[PDB]
Structures are given as structure tokens and as C-alpha cells.
Amino acid sequence: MLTNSEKSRFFLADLTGEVQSIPNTYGYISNLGLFRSAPITQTTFLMDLTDWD
Amino acid sequence: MLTNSEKSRFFLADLTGEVQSIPNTYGYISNLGLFRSAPITQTTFLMDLTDWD
């Protein structure tokens, strides 16, 4: 693939290709499967607690 | 299940179950079954001890 030179409009130079970089993305805990899914239909929710000795 | 909001009688919010806690109960020695049941009729009992040399 011939392209324009570095500092001239009439000479040609050879282009090789691209070098892509992608950031790292850790996903250990996400795929561990600990957390369950509990969809709700309200802005908030409540919960009760109990105990005895 | 839907219930009243935190501070409004005319709004609803979701109630997500309950959580319970129970005290611990160790039973190791009872399960060992060392002791026998010897029911009696009176409020006291006696025994005899003997020996020789």
C-alpha cells in the first residue's frame, strides 16, 4: 500500500498496518455466580428481622 | 407483597421476606449416650460398699 511521503506530495512510501490496544477488563467476581437476581416493581423494599435466646 | 410506604399512607413499597436467627445448642455429650435411665419411686436411694485386702 503506497501512500504520500512523510514531507512531500510527490514521493511515495509503504504503509504496513495498524497496531491496536485495548484496556484490561477484570471479571472474576462477576462470573463467580454468587449474587442472585431479584427483580422488583417498586422504588424501595422492606425486610423483617427476628431472634430469640 | 405490597405494603405502605415508609412515611406515606397513600404509597406502596415491596416487602422482601424475613430473616431469623436462632441460638446455638451444643449436644455432644448427650449424643454420646454414656448415662442410663434408672427411674425410681422414692425421693432417695441407697447403696452398699464392700472390700477386702
The answer to whether the Cβ–Cβ distance between B14 and A50 falls below 8 Å is no
H or E segment to which residue B11 belongs = none
Q: Please identify among residues 1-53 of chain A the ones whose CB lies closer than 8 Å to any CB of chain B.
A: 38, 40-53
Q: Across-strand partners of A49?
A: B19
Cβ-contact A47, B15 below 8 angstroms: yes
Chain A residues near residue B25 by CB distance under 8 angstroms: none
Resolution in A: 3.4
Q: Cα(B1)–Cα(A47) distance, rounded to whole angstroms?
A: 11
Which set of grid coordinates corresponds to residue B18?
Answer: 424475613
Given an 8 Å threshold on Cβ–Cβ distance, is B23 in contact with A49? no
Distance CA B36, CA B5 (A): 59
Q: Which of B3, B21, B23 sits opposite A46 (nearest CB)?
A: B3
Q: What method did the depositors use to determine the structure?
A: cryo-EM
Cell numbers describing residue B45: 436411694
Q: Three-state SS for A14?
A: strand
